Design a protein around this ligand. Structure first.
Ligand SMILES: C[C@H](CC(=O)O)OP(=O)(O)O
Length: 106
């Protein structure tokens, strides 16, 4: 189960640059947060998705930036409470790439 920016496996993906600006988002990610691409692209993630600040996701991204290592966690979703998700964050070519998978039926 090793989805990445190229082989997304139908999962929601977002990529952030070194200023944590949203430089890539797919449709599944947009539907999850219930936003349009124009609202998020090029914006600093904490500005347009402020619910992520101080959350597990904040810690997850910080750990990737501080160690370079991939991080994965299983948590209740911020944007869809009651949905159990597995969230992965990793560096891929200078970008910080995040994806999530609904694991509610597991
Ligand atoms: C925080 C979110 C997953 C969640 O709903 O907890 O991930 P994205 O910011 O949409 O990549």
């Amino acid at each position: 189960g090793r989805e990445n920016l190229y082989f997304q496996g139908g999962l929601g993906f977002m990529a952030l640059d070194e200023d944590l600006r949203i430089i890539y988002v797919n449709s599944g990610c947009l539907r999850h947060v219930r936003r349009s691409r124009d609202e998020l692209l090029g914006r600093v993630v904490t500005e347009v998705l402020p619910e992520t600040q101080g959350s597990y996701f904040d810690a997850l991204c910080r750990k990737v930036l501080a160690t370079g290592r991939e991080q994965q966690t299983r948590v209740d979703s911020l944007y869809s409470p009651g949905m159990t998700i597995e969230v992965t964050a990793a560096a891929d070519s200078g970008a910080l790439v995040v994806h999530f998978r609904d694991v509610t039926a597991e």
